[PDB]
Design a protein around this ligand. Structure first.
Ligand SMILES: Cc1cc2nc3c(=O)[nH]c(=O)nc-3n(C[C@H](O)[C@H](O)[C@H](O)COP(=O)(O)OP(=O)(O)OC[C@H]3O[C@@H](n4cnc5c(N)ncnc54)[C@H](O)[C@@H]3O)c2cc1C
Ligand SMILES: Cc1cc2nc3c(=O)[nH]c(=O)nc-3n(C[C@H](O)[C@H](O)[C@H](O)COP(=O)(O)OP(=O)(O)OC[C@H]3O[C@@H](n4cnc5c(N)ncnc54)[C@H](O)[C@@H]3O)c2cc1C
Ligand SMILES: CCCCCCCCCCCCO
Lengths: 543, 555
């Protein structure tokens, strides 16, 4: 769980995840994941090659510029640092298709000048003070999992850029059993956090698909949302306290009250601030007893529309299981071709379910969902379609790399939307993608798939996957980037949000002002100018 | 429920609630409420008098010019062209010069305010509010919004040295439901609508919000958003921050509004949270989208008696750990149990004063939802309560407590008639501090009162009113007979400030829901840190550069 300083040792320098885990062909011509890390690791997938082929129509460095007297004072602190090219390049990007393309086939315009590794809050304080005194720029990094250009260094930033890496600041400080909270350092990952709590009988239940690398400070910065938010909350519900180092000083509430009325909630000034205001160093998070029992389920529907109506009714009755997804036909089959070993199969849709809690509770809940689903032509579809629909959110980032080795570019994007817009939004957005690809000269209809991933009282989170064979297409990236901007326009035109959880970074900046209004934007600017008047936190996300 | 412009016609000008509802001595010499509004209205309460007497040491036989309107003539000329209703009448202005703190009421009964609004305006829509804010930029005016006037933090008090013309911008005529969306289960409303009228109107379509603060009869959507209001059934429905899905705000800089109605976003820091808790300092909230739910099938009341307060707390904690809190659960201490008891109809004899009865505590419970779920739930909660010595004290005690919430504020006026000053205050605290905080804060109150030369021990009681994962809301009530005391307001105000220190020192917050206003300003920086304070200031300075919104709450 602890990220070592030298990341490339165990992680891919040009891709998602670990070095020891990549899809290859076993000695039977079947796709299989390498290594021993996962459930699916070493598990052969007889059907997956046939799925790719049929679906896509295929066969199968800048110098370190640093002030010498700053550097001298930094030697005195004993904080570990690096000016090595591979360290700096590793931290120059997140996991946008664009950025991954560049790493494989080119170089970044700008990369951090030096990497620093504080181990505690006081080290962060020194670093922020040094950056004030010497006029440095700080971009914080935790997991490096940003999908929003949130870690990209601005091309024209001429100051020394410090990549402030939070990975060695990763302790559980205290677990409070009476209040059911855990106070942690911001660089701890989801994986390591859960491993450690579990040993004491607790969990956080915060499970973003990137939990392996993505950190507590990253979740707060980007307003992260987890797979089981229906039980545990999204990040804004989980956090009860935080400590933040800004150029102006340290933000921290004086007490750990569960809920306050003491003016506008300054925790909300920091959540969603995407590295632009300071460094979150410590956070207090709600914890829970480990669930007794878990069960997967799934449900088939005659079409997408009926499935959507069903999830809505589920949310209306306020009995969503720990997690419920709805997949459209394409994705269902994407998922179906992940197995080892009527209704109109064009439009047939599948919901996946995950229940957790005490056993007779789960079992009693499971019967309540199926009845509700019965009303909408849904029939129980069994456990293992359940399991593997989820593992489809979890390995996908491995698949994207595989895709790239065979001239396939793909990405995901998401929106939230009100319940009465979901059906039209999905249909119109998937179609917009097909139309744009045609018009740009893509020879094969792209993969254009969506799934509903979160329900709320007022609406849903919608996930989209988009991918095409770039065969005899001159410029594959830029076509892609244009198609994805068009899909955003389609999303906003259908009443969807700029983002549900990924965030804005530099990728969705141009839309922020209309989304939050001019004055809204102005309010954000005015906090930035007060807390960080010299713009030390100059990743230039959001504004 | 639509507030008329001239409030004093229906409402007390020197106290809480309606004109037709007050306590009095009936012809049998027993305390009774006049009028018909409440379930207790017109019901004799034989034992109340004794309790007052036993608890306060009074026999109950012993009872007890305005600033000119300064307004610029050309502004006034431009205001006439808008057709926005206004008044410069003294009684309209005095009405809107206060909330419901003890100190303010005392003043209304025995003196006059240093400073009251110069003019009252009644916009009926969002565009009116924009005209008024534009007019105040142009003419250098100051604006204090008011909705229900139920602030208990000095949130509405006009600063004495404010020299500009003060506009009391009254939102009571902005009260419509603009749309009820049944696919999305949301309602879009104008900010001036009251809890009571909002629910009444949703009910006709099959809906409710379930936000029920004790002041719902007067308090408003805009008000709730400004003060971060908390309602009794937040366990089911959420507090104000969970209920609001969208809002529209008018500021001197322009109009704050998100472009979409998504349930949840990651588009930077959530600007809704800049406006919730702003207490009138930034602009007028004009419109808001709120979650609604189908009207619950069935409601059920319950109660449980515990050996002591401590065991009761431990049970509440455990209910929260299993996450099966009823729609509402209150744990009241012994004194409050006994007070409840004084309000039953059975007339005792005049020669007449396995649980120990001056130690036991009572939790009151309310469940709502589908009949079937309610009943499983009820049974589940009692099973837990039993593991803590809890025995069901029955549904009539449950129903009684939940009715008495809306009549308690009328009791304070009664007390003031007989030389008794009292006030409530609240805090939120971590689970592991609740027991000590309650004990120490109550004991601090007694010590303070004795040391300030109060003859008779004060009423010093508490209840736990909300449970959360991380803690609880605790509600205090504090009251004493001030006969013989030289400076009673000063004594009270000093005691309440010591209780507040005693609260902070025991791990509790500055406020769970009443908020800061001008009453708790001195503690804010330390509560939120200097930089936290700094950040709020920077938004105020951007959104309201010339401090048009000049009630001076918070900062
Ligand atoms: C395969 C994959 C799956 C994903 N699944 C999910 C998901 O389920 N749910 C979800 O919400 N997101 C998901 N994401 C997006 C991303 O993981 C989240 O936004 C994550 O929270 C970012 O955390 P991190 O530690 O990697 O932050 P980083 O990538 O390291 O940084 C993100 C932003 O936060 C700033 N920042 C980071 N740390 C701090 C700090 N401590 N103090 C101040 N600023 C800081 C950075 O400067 C940057 O702007 C996924 C991404 C990938 C690639
Ligand atoms: C007996 C009693 C019981 C109470 N019970 C509760 C309770 O259970 N829960 C709870 O949370 N509170 C309770 N309160 C406190 C109070 O009702 C709440 O704080 C409520 O939110 C105030 O709303 P209001 O409409 O009366 O606002 P007002 O007092 O009229 O306004 C309060 C503040 O908000 C401003 N304001 C009003 N409208 C707007 C507008 N639309 N835009 C911008 N600013 C505005 C005012 O200028 C002032 O600063 C109680 C008060 C009393 C007296
Ligand atoms: C082999 C098929 C390629 C499909 C492309 C889909 C890529 C989605 C990965 C992005 C990760 C964000 O959640």
């Amino acid at each position: 769980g602890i990220i070592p300083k030298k990341r490339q040792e165990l992680m891919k320098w040009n891709g998602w995840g670990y070095n020891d885990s990549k899809f290859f062909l076993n000695k039977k011509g079947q796709l299989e994941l390498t290594g021993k890390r996962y459930p699916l690791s070493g598990v052969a997938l007889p059907t997956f090659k046939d799925w790719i082929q049929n679906t896509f129509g295929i066969n199968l460095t800048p110098p370190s510029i640093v002030n010498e007297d700053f550097l001298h004072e930094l030697k005195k602190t004993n904080i570990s640092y690096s000016q090595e090219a591979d360290d700096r390049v590793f931290r120059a990007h997140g996991h946008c298709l664009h950025e991954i393309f560049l790493l494989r086939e080119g170089m970044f315009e700008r990369i951090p000048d030096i990497v620093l590794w504080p181990t505690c809050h006081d080290d962060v304080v020194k670093i922020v003070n040094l950056a004030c005194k010497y006029n440095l720029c700080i971009i914080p990094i935790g997991g490096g999992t940003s999908v929003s250009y949130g870690l990209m260094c601005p091309a024209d930033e001429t100051r020394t850029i410090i990549s402030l890496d939070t990975s060695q600041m990763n302790r559980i400080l205290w677990v409070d059993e009476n209040n059911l909270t855990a106070h942690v350092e911001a660089g701890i990952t989801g994986q390591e956090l859960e491993r450690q709590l579990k040993e004491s009988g607790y969990c956080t239940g915060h499970e973003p698909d990137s939990l392996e690398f993505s950190t507590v400070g990253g979740w707060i910065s980007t307003r992260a949302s987890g797979m089981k938010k229906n039980i545990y909350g999204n990040i804004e519900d989980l956090v009860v306290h935080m400590k933040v180092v800004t150029p102006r000083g340290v933000i921290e509430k004086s007490c750990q009250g569960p809920r306050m009325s003491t003016g506008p909630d300054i925790h909300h000034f920091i959540m969603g601030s995407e590295g632009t205001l300071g460094v979150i160093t410590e956070a207090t998070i709600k914890i829970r007893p480990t669930p007794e029992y878990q069960k997967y389920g799934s449900v088939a529907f005659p079409n997408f529309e009926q499935g959507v109506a069903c999830l809505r009714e589920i949310a209306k009755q306020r009995c969503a299981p720990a997690s419920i997804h709805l997949m459209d036909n394409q994705q269902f089959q994407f998922g179906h071709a992940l197995k080892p070993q009527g209704f109109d199969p064009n439009q047939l849709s599948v919901a996946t379910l995950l229940f957790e809690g005490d056993r007779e509770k789960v079992l009693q809940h499971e019967k309540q969902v199926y009845d509700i689903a019965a009303k909408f032509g849904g029939l129980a579809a069994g456990e293992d379609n359940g399991q593997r629909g989820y593992l489809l959110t979890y390995v996908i980032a491995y698949m994207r790399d595989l895709g790239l080795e065979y001239y396939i570019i793909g990405e995901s994007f998401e929106t939230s939307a009100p319940w009465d817009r979901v059906v039209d939004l999905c249909r119109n957005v998937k179609e917009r993608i097909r139309r744009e690809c045609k018009e740009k000269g893509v020879q094969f209809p792209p993969l254009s798939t969506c799934r509903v991933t979160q329900t709320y009282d007022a609406g849903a989170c919608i996930y989209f996957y988009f991918a095409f064979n770039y065969r005899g297409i001159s410029d594959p990236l830029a076509v892609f980037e244009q198609t994805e901007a068009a899909a955003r326009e389609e999303i906003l035109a259908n009443g969807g949000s700029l983002s549900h959880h990924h965030g804005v970074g530099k990728l969705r900046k141009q839309w922020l002002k209309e989304s939050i209004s001019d004055v809204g934007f102005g309010m954000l600017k005015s906090v930035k100018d007060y807390v960080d008047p010299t713009n030390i936190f100059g990743n230039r996300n959001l504004l």
